[PDB]
Amino acid sequence: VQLVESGGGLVQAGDSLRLSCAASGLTFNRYNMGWFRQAPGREREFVASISWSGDRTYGTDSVKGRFAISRDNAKNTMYLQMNSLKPEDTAVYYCAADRFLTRSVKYDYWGQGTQVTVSS
Protein backbone atom coordinates (compact mmCIF):
# COMPACT_ATOMS: atom_id res chain seq x y z
CA VAL A 1 0.00 0.00 0.00
CA GLN A 2 1.18 3.52 -0.89
CA LEU A 3 -0.64 6.78 -0.04
CA VAL A 4 0.96 9.89 -1.59
CA GLU A 5 -0.09 13.38 -0.51
CA SER A 6 0.50 16.46 -2.67
CA GLY A 7 -0.40 20.15 -2.75
CA GLY A 8 1.33 21.49 0.35
CA GLY A 9 3.31 24.72 0.56
CA LEU A 10 3.15 28.28 1.86
CA VAL A 11 -0.13 30.25 1.81
CA GLN A 12 -1.30 33.56 3.35
CA ALA A 13 -4.02 33.83 6.07
CA GLY A 14 -7.46 33.85 4.41
CA ASP A 15 -6.38 31.69 1.41
CA SER A 16 -7.92 28.50 0.04
CA LEU A 17 -5.84 25.40 -0.80
CA ARG A 18 -6.54 21.94 -2.29
CA LEU A 19 -4.62 18.86 -1.11
CA SER A 20 -4.70 15.53 -2.92
CA CYS A 21 -3.96 11.91 -2.00
CA ALA A 22 -3.06 9.30 -4.64
CA ALA A 23 -3.52 5.66 -3.48
CA SER A 24 -2.06 2.43 -4.90
CA GLY A 25 -1.68 -1.19 -3.75
CA LEU A 26 -5.24 -1.55 -2.35
CA THR A 27 -8.81 -1.85 -3.65
CA PHE A 28 -9.53 1.87 -3.19
CA ASN A 29 -13.35 1.76 -3.41
CA ARG A 30 -13.48 -0.62 -0.36
CA TYR A 31 -11.69 1.83 2.00
CA ASN A 32 -12.71 4.78 4.12
CA MET A 33 -10.22 7.60 3.35
CA GLY A 34 -9.22 10.18 5.92
CA TRP A 35 -7.19 13.36 6.39
CA PHE A 36 -5.33 13.92 9.70
CA ARG A 37 -2.87 16.64 10.70
CA GLN A 38 -0.08 17.28 13.15
CA ALA A 39 0.50 20.93 14.03
CA PRO A 40 3.43 22.35 16.09
CA GLY A 41 3.07 21.37 19.79
CA ARG A 42 -0.05 19.22 19.22
CA GLU A 43 -0.91 15.55 18.96
CA ARG A 44 -1.87 14.12 15.54
CA GLU A 45 -5.62 14.73 15.10
CA PHE A 46 -8.59 14.02 12.92
CA VAL A 47 -9.56 16.51 10.13
CA ALA A 48 -12.07 14.69 7.86
CA SER A 49 -13.08 11.29 6.48
CA ILE A 50 -15.05 10.00 3.50
CA SER A 51 -16.41 6.47 3.84
CA TRP A 52 -16.38 3.99 0.98
CA SER A 53 -20.17 4.59 0.85
CA GLY A 54 -19.53 8.34 0.35
CA ASP A 55 -20.54 9.65 3.78
CA ARG A 56 -18.45 12.67 4.91
CA THR A 57 -17.42 13.30 8.55
CA TYR A 58 -15.54 16.39 9.85
CA GLY A 59 -13.41 17.15 12.90
CA THR A 60 -14.11 19.76 15.59
CA ASP A 61 -14.89 23.49 15.19
CA SER A 62 -13.37 25.04 12.07
CA VAL A 63 -13.60 21.97 9.73
CA LYS A 64 -17.33 21.42 8.78
CA GLY A 65 -17.74 25.06 7.73
CA ARG A 66 -14.30 25.57 6.19
CA PHE A 67 -13.13 22.25 4.68
CA ALA A 68 -14.62 19.77 2.19
CA ILE A 69 -13.51 16.19 1.53
CA SER A 70 -14.22 14.26 -1.68
CA ARG A 71 -13.05 11.14 -3.54
CA ASP A 72 -12.70 10.08 -7.20
CA ASN A 73 -12.80 6.29 -7.24
CA ALA A 74 -11.91 6.11 -10.99
CA LYS A 75 -8.62 7.95 -10.28
CA ASN A 76 -7.95 6.25 -6.83
CA THR A 77 -7.52 9.78 -5.45
CA MET A 78 -9.14 11.76 -2.66
CA TYR A 79 -9.05 15.50 -1.90
CA LEU A 80 -9.22 18.09 0.85
CA GLN A 81 -10.48 21.56 -0.14
CA MET A 82 -9.45 24.00 2.63
CA ASN A 83 -10.92 27.54 2.86
CA SER A 84 -10.39 30.61 5.16
CA LEU A 85 -7.01 29.26 6.33
CA LYS A 86 -5.45 30.61 9.54
CA PRO A 87 -1.90 30.46 11.03
CA GLU A 88 -3.14 27.71 13.46
CA ASP A 89 -3.82 25.50 10.33
CA THR A 90 0.01 25.23 9.85
CA ALA A 91 0.67 21.47 10.07
CA VAL A 92 1.75 18.33 8.28
CA TYR A 93 -1.40 16.89 6.60
CA TYR A 94 -1.61 13.09 6.28
CA CYS A 95 -3.71 10.82 4.03
CA ALA A 96 -4.89 7.55 5.65
CA ALA A 97 -6.93 4.45 4.63
CA ASP A 98 -8.96 1.93 6.67
CA ARG A 99 -11.82 -0.46 5.90
CA PHE A 100 -13.74 0.45 9.11
CA LEU A 101 -12.62 3.52 11.03
CA THR A 102 -13.80 7.12 10.59
CA ARG A 103 -12.66 9.53 13.36
CA SER A 104 -10.09 7.30 15.15
CA VAL A 105 -6.37 7.98 14.54
CA LYS A 106 -5.88 4.15 14.47
CA TYR A 107 -6.23 3.79 10.62
CA ASP A 108 -4.23 0.86 9.16
CA TYR A 109 -2.46 2.76 6.32
CA TRP A 110 -0.75 6.13 6.24
CA GLY A 111 1.04 8.45 3.87
CA GLN A 112 4.20 10.40 4.81
CA GLY A 113 2.42 13.77 4.76
CA THR A 114 2.47 17.13 2.96
CA GLN A 115 3.37 20.29 4.89
CA VAL A 116 1.20 23.42 4.87
CA THR A 117 2.34 26.78 6.34
CA VAL A 118 -0.19 29.64 6.73
CA SER A 119 1.56 32.96 7.39
CA SER A 120 0.09 35.81 9.51
Distance CA 89, CA 31 (A): 26
Domains of the chain: 1-120 (2.60.40.10)
Distance CA 92, CA 4 (A): 13
Distance CA 115, CA 117 (A): 7
b/e burial code for range 8-23 (CB count within 10 A of at least 16 → b): beebeeeeebebbbbb
Using only the alpha carbons of the chain, give its radius of gyration: 13
Decide: helix, strand or coil at residue 50. strand
Distance CA 75, CA 91 (A): 26
b/e burial code for range 30-69 (CB count within 10 A of at least 16 → b): ebbbbbbbebeeeeeebbbbbbbeeeebbbeeebeebbbb
CA 63 → CA 3, 69, 99, distances in Å?
A: 22, 10, 23
Question: How do beta strands 9-12 and 114-119 pair?
Answer: parallel
Resolution limit in angstroms? Answer: 1.5
